[PDB]
């Protein structure tokens, strides 16, 4: 929105009047205000002639990013921003789908180390927290305050005064405090917010990448279950990464934004350990595995009947499957071999991830929803950016 706006804020004063109505009749096409073909002159404008080519090719995401490239700016990486920034405080909000907690780990590792993750949980965590805060500034270590919004009542009393009083934090050793927020969620005090630097973690992982990230930790748990189980834990890895991928695509996709957690995976895997623990190793237990995953574990938060069918139809494909599953078009998962090596099978199932590379059309090929729905969605988020910019121009 700020791209398209600032582009028109510059070029309307700088370029021709014929330029003005041409680009505006284009921004009108991206929005549902109007549809037209702009005024066309041989060699008259070439950058503008290149833009309409994006809009006429029904390619929406491309035409929206056009205005970003036209700024000719290095779009600053949270690291660069932090490095430039000259304050010991930062609040980075983000959507509930992701958390930049793990981005901060690699940000600290690559420069200055000193990573300290601090959950604000109960009295103990806030109480330990306030102790680790006063000591880290003297030490100069980095600190993170995970999900403050929940512990907020405390913020207005202890943190609001504490951060305000600490003008000696400038005097104190190189130290940097970070706080994670959620944009959809409890509203932070404005005065504390204005004092502290702000970032939005907008970095969304691909399906395959999230599968690899789910499966990655799973080896840390040890070994307590069958070799066969690791196959079901692999199945769930794909499943969870497939519904999370669907969560963002709405309305086309899911009816509302639903949030699914690492808690949802945990409650699902717990049920899986339990079904394999209470049944024989025969594959056929599969029937009530789907029902319980699709209606209690994940279908719990779902309230709309439309969407409850979608979670079920995902379980239909991810869980029931004899000999070959074929989660995605390219990748087939075969059921455990007779050799029954549990160490081999981990490595085999990791290898199947390393073999595949996520296609261009992933959201339509992998999430079995149609291509025409994805375009419908691309069109709508285009319309939202284009609208809000026109609104902004006329307001000033």
């Amino acid at each position: 929105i700020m791209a398209m706006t600032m582009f028109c804020l510059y070029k309307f004063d700088i370029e021709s009047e014929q330029y003005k109505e041409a680009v505006l009749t284009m921004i009108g096409v991206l929005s549902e205000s109007s549809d037209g073909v702009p005024k066309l002159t041989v060699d008259t404008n070439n950058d503008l002639r290149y833009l309409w080519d994006y809009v006429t090719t029904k390619s929406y995401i491309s035409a929206l990013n056009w205005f970003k490239n036209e700024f000719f700016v290095d779009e600053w990486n949270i690291a660069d921003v932090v490095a430039n920034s000259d304050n010991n405080y930062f609040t980075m909000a983000s959507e509930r789908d992701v958390d930049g907690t793990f981005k901060l780990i690699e940000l600290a590792k690559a420069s200055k180390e000193s990573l300290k993750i601090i959950p604000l949980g109960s009295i103990e965590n806030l109480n330990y927290a306030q102790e680790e805060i006063s000591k880290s500034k003297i030490e100069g270590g980095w600190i993170l305050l995970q999900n403050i919004q929940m512990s907020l009542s405390w913020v207005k009393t202890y943190l609001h005064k504490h951060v305000e009083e600490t003008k000696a934090a400038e005097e104190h050793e190189k130290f940097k405090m970070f706080m994670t927020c959620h944009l959809t969620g409890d509203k932070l005090p404005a005065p504390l917010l204005q004092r502290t630097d702000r970032f939005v973690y907008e970095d969304i992982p691909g399906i395959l990448d999230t599968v690899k990230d789910l499966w990655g930790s799973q080896f840390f748990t040890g070994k307590i279950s069958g070799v066969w189980s690791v196959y079901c834990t692999f199945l769930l890895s794909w499943f969870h990464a497939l519904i999370t991928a669907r969560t963002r695509l709405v309305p086309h996709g899911f009816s509302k934004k639903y949030y699914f957690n690492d808690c949802d995976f945990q409650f699902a895997s717990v049920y899986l350990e339990n079904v394999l623990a209470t049944n024989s190793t025969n594959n056929i237990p599969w029937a009530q595995v789907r029902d319980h995953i699709a209606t209690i574990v994940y279908g719990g938060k779902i309230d709309e009947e439309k969407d409850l069918e979608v979670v079920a139809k995902l379980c239909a494909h991810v869980f029931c499957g004899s000999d070959n599953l074929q989660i995605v078009p390219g990748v087939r998962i075969p059921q455990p071999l007779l050799q029954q090596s549990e160490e081999e099978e981990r490595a085999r199932l990791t290898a199947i991830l390393s073999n595949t590379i996520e296609p261009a059309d992933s959201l339509s090929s992998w999430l079995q929803l149609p291509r025409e729905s994805i375009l419908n969605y691309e069109r709508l988020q285009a319309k939202e950016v284009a609208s809000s910019t026109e609104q902004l121009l006329q307001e000033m």
């Binding site: 339990n274 079904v275 209606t295």
Partner: protein
Amino acid sequence: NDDLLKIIGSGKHHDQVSKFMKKMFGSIESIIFLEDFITGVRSVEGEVLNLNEKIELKDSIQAQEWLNILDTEIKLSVFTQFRDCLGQIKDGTDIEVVVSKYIFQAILLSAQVMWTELVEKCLQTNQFSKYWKEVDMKIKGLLDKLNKSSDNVKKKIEALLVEYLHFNNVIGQLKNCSTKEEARLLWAKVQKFYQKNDTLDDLNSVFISQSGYLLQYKFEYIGIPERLIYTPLLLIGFATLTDSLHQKYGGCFFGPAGTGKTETVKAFGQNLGRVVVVFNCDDSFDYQVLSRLLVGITQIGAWGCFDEFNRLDEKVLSAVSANIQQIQNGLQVGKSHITLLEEETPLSPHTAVFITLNPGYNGRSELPENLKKSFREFSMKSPQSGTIAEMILQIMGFEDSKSLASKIVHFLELLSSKCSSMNHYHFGLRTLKGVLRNCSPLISEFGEGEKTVVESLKRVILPSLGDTDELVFKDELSKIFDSAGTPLNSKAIVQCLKDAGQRSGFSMSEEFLKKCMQFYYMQKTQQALILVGKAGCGKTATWKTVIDAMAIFDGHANVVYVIDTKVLTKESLYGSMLKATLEWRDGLFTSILRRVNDDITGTFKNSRIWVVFDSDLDPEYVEAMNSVLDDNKILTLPNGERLPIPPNFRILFETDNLDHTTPATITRCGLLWFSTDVCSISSKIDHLLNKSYEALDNKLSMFELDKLKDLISDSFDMASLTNIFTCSNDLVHILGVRTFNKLETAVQLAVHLISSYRQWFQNLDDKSLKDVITLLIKRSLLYALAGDSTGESQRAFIQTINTYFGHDSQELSDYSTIVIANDKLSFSSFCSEIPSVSLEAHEVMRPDIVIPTIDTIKHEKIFYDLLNSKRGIILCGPPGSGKTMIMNNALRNSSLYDVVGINFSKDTTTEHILSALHRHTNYVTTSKGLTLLPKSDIKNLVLFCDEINLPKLDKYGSQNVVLFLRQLMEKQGFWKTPENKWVTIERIHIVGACNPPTDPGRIPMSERFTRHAAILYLGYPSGKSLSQIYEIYYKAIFKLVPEFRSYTEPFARASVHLYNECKARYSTGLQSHYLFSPRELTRLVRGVYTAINTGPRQTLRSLIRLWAYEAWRIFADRLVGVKEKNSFEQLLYETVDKYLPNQDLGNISSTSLLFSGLLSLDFKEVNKTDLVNFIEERFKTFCDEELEVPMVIHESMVDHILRIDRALKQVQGHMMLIGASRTGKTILTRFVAWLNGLKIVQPKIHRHSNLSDFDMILKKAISDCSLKESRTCLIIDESNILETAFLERMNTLLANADIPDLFQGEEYDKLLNNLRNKTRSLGLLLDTEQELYDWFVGEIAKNLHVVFTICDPTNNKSSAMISSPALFNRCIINWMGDWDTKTMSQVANNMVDVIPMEFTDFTIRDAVVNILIHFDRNFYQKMKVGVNPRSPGYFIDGLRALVKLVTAKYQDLQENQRFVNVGLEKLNESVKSLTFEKERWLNTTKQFSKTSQELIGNCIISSIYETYFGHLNERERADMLVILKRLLGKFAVKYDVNYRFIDYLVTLDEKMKW
């Protein structure tokens, strides 16, 4: 603490602990002893549990010690009763045997364990059918046992039935499975109750499996609770709860209210032998108590449910939510001890927290963030009904329960898709539970077959359907299932219904029989009945007919109580409690029940009691009775009690709409929708006639009666009238009422008009007789259909009547009348004869003066005729149309009726009506009607309710004051608000005037009230009658100037011309207050008289100017701006030239004609020079004597002083001044009031002022005006009106001249006493109570004078002032909205009168003032937006800044010029080498003249910065400065080009300090 102390204290007794157990256990109510020994405990349900070991007690034993043993033994005792029982059933024992000896909790668990065991093996063998019948038989066996059982064990069987149905249902489902895998899937979803045949610790022996997860049954007593029917949905909820608990997480379900989320958590507990503690959150619930209970739950290891957690207050919610985290975080980790409420308390791992989340207006609620990773949220949904339906059918006596449940649901579901979407239609399960509930008595009549279901569908669903949907029901009912041909109770009721209606007057039509049948069948089943329909549908007729037919058929009498629901308050009706003394008095609804319940002294047992609510029904009132509408059938008091209602006592609701009521309220009651009127137009008439004839029998001989009823029948036939009523619709009706309800108006009139001429029907010609009849009937028919019509339409309809009636029959004329002789019986038809009026000068304005017109007589006759009928009248029409006078003069004349005037305001109460009646009415306690309320004198009384469409309506939208009148009109008696008894009003009439409700201020009236009124729309007259009427007005006042008696007509024609033109030129399209009527004319004519009656003998040039003055004050003072104001100047000129052609007139503008009685003893035109000087000498005096404030007396102000003066002189003097701000409107008012010798009262309001404060301010000012003869002038500013009511009080003080409320009850009696004292002191005793009050009010009207000062009429609160009718009509609106350029210059000049200045280029003073005006004109023109709300203020303060700044700068310029002159004398004394440069210092000396040139214009800029700039932007200031500098450039004033506001007024010492 307090309860606990009672237990430690009550130890001696022991038995007194049983009270407190109910709390600390939840299941049990009281404990059983053998005194030394505890034999057992009994539950809140009534079930008796006996322990294994009776616990021994001694006196010196502690409660804590003995009770702790009981908790342990109570659980053990349940295991014992469980194993004992389980073992029995295992040994092939019929369940009917077991029930009689084992507690429910035990038997339930035993069933579950054996069931589970028996089905577990049955999955392997697939022997389902063998086990199924087996189970099915136990079900039937239990059912028949129940019918013959003791109420206590009746609970136990029913509770078990819920379970056995579950058993068989699951087995049947299992029989049906395609394969064995299918069966193992279904079985996994179910709650399977296992026992360990392995092990010790028996309390821990029973466990429960579901979805693979296990959960140990704790052995707590549950008693015998109401067990929820098992649904798939219920199991899924159980399954989510078990899935959360298994992983040590909290259970949480969100969803819409009525989805049973807490009931689930209660049940999920029970299934596992746990009594869940439910916290109803935010029912004004303390945090301190909850914090205690949370510690107890973590110690005792119980389950807590937060019932509607969402509803907590943010401070509480934070605190609670944080605590809950401790518990759930303690569990997930498993910490042995956790800290909460800042103390170390231990945590049982059996503990769980459950949260139910009702949705807000915004959405389905959420858990606080911290709780999100501690709980598991789930979505409760209403149960798909089919499953509930089947079980319910199973319990009653099934037949085929599966087919009915599928079929009923399909049909209900089908109706929903196939009927119209109508508001009150509910085809939700609530509805099928109701069909099913209604089914049980029905089964008794017929069968446990579909046919009984079919009938119950049409018993419930059909009475609420409307004609289109009524077939859809019938079409799809037969489409889904066909049952039978013939109905029971078909003949017997029907002849009892026909016989009741023949007696009542009614006609048994298709529909009237139908809705009578629908009703009869419903009272049977339903105890609360609703009747919904249009006003005049037939409801009162339906129920009054059916109820009457039941006393014929049963032999049971009825006792009906018809109460208007919304006339009385919730406190007047249910029971009102007083906050401090807590004194409880009965009410109305509750007090009539105490006759039946508390003391059935006479016969109530064999009687049927019906309490009818005739008024509109709303949530607040039904919610206060919802418990009677519930399955409870008991009344719950606000404080003190529950009163149970018998089966005789039925509550009916007749109303016109439902919009307000909740779907929950409908579905508890039986709803009877009246799609259309029960009865035919004709049939209505028929009944109406006969109803009218019965009244006459009491006052007319049978011979007379027999003959007159014969006449009516042969004169009017239905065939003719049918077209007449049809044509009635093709007509524009003011105050619209439907044809059908207008009928009573015809027949009641018609019969009275014929009973009028009864004597002349003895000897008159039989052909001629018919002509008298037909004429009357054609007349009465006209006003009843077209009376509320334009009359332009009446005339048109008159021909329409004539058309459709027989051609030969006496035709109707506009003014057609029947006439008989003064001294001899005669007969002839003549119309329009008028008595001729001559009135003296003094008579001219009087609240009771009528100059009769062809039309005044026409209306006054019809108006009087309707009252003879005694039908209520609504005179609807424009303001000044004469609706009040026509009503008043027709009755001020006759001996029969006596009028009583009530004015209604936006918020008037039903008590004000009563208090106004009490003044002219006397209650008599005659045993004939019990209490009655006739008039205080023998002959008939008429309430005149003026502005009847003014009182406002409940937020629901229901005006009670109107419903009260409706009560009086229809019921003829009302219920006493405090004393609670029926008083039947005798011989009292209701008449009302209202404005068209298309007019602003006006409220739409309920058809249920206007149905009992005859409506006559009276409009404005002619423009040629108006000319004629005011001729007679001028004729009367020109008795005082007989030399111009020939001038009355062109004055009357001119006045009317001026009126017609003002009304045309200045409309409500330009300004809202531009509203003219013949009241203006009357204002003008009287305004003219008062000038004459107190003026010098008059020349023709005088009188036209006298007339012109009043013309200005009446028509043009209200005019805004100048384009319109000048338009009137030209109009006034145009009118005199057209009607009074003279060359003797002068300047007719208001500024040039100034008339006053301040200078002369006689009201005369005064000299401008003579007046200004007179004001000047009196203002100094007023300035000296009163508050010291100096001002400039200017041309506008003199004109305005006279305007206020005239206002404050007239009997009723109300002027509202519209002056922007600082115009001086408040100061002039104080002045002119002081000249007139008025006490100036100004309400001392403030932010923390109550209505009571203002009430006091008002009351005093009123009491002083009458009982002290004070003569006060009340100045009310727009700021003083803090609420709606404050302005309403001001209205009551102008529409009437008293505020009723201030003096009521005892304070009425004290006023009344004091009134008699002063009246006699003055020397007049007044015969009656009415004679007294009218002195009081009249005294106020002439001594209290209200002036309003509103600044921005654009403001919505100040708009409401001008809007208010009371204020608009009785105030003189006056406009001062802006200072004109001339008045600005006048004021500017006198402020810069002080002359520091010296000669400049070009006048110097003249230039300065012209700049400031041109700056103020440019400031508001550039900066301010919006249309002319704001005016000269900064201008005054900008001039005041300049004066202070020039004086400060010129005295400092002359001070520095004196500092260089003193240095000039000192250097000349000395004269060496450098000092002659110092002498040269004439550059500075030369410089001074240039410095002084610019200081006047520099002060201009500095003053403008201080005043105009303070609130302007960086750029806004700079830009105005340029416009100021270029204004300084046009005018020959010099300014500094390099000028800086900071450096010019800030000093470096101060700039540093800041």
